[PDB]
Design a protein around this nucleic acid. Structure first.
Ligand SMILES: [Zn+2]
Ligand SMILES: [Zn+2]
Ligand SMILES: [Zn+2]
Ligand SMILES: [Zn+2]
Ligand SMILES: [Zn+2]
Ligand SMILES: [Zn+2]
Length: 108
DNA sequence: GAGTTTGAAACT
DNA sequence: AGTTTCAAACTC
């Protein structure tokens, strides 16, 4: 959906949101893109290396480790997904919980 | 547009 | 676990 602007990763790593969502890049702004039909062999390699690192990498779709955002900035994957942090999050200084004032203020 | 900040993903 | 890399979020 939204264009990636990768240069260094070739869009063959999870730093690339297009590749992380199991898509070919389309109309993106990436450089040296391998996330496409023209690089099928090398792309397949990246996929399996990506997968044996974590077998759930491309599972149909746990917790943040934010230090400085307070989890009220879109650096927090919880906040970006517009959901609350949970017990599994290893946040520090988390202000992204139900009864949080700052969260409520930033909500309006 | 440039430069800084951030934390997941990667690497050692 | 500590460190580096990376592309996006953010700030100016
Ligand atoms: Zn990309
Ligand atoms: Zn892309
Ligand atoms: Zn790409
Ligand atoms: Zn967070
Ligand atoms: Zn969280
Ligand atoms: Zn949090």
């Amino acid at each position: 959906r939204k264009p990636c602007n990768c240069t260094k990763s070739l869009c063959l790593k999870l730093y690339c949101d297009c590749f992380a969502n199991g898509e070919f890049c389309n109309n993106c702004n990436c450089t040296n893109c391998y996330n496409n039909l023209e690089h099928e062999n090398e792309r397949q390699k990246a996929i399996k290396a990506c997968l044996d690192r974590n077998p759930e990498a491309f599972k149909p779709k746990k917790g943040c480790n934010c230090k400085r955002s307070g989890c009220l900035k879109n650096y927090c994957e919880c906040y970006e997904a517009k959901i609350m942090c949970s017990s599994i999050c290893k946040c520090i200084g988390c202000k992204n919980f139900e009864e949080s004032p700052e969260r409520k203020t930033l909500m309006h």
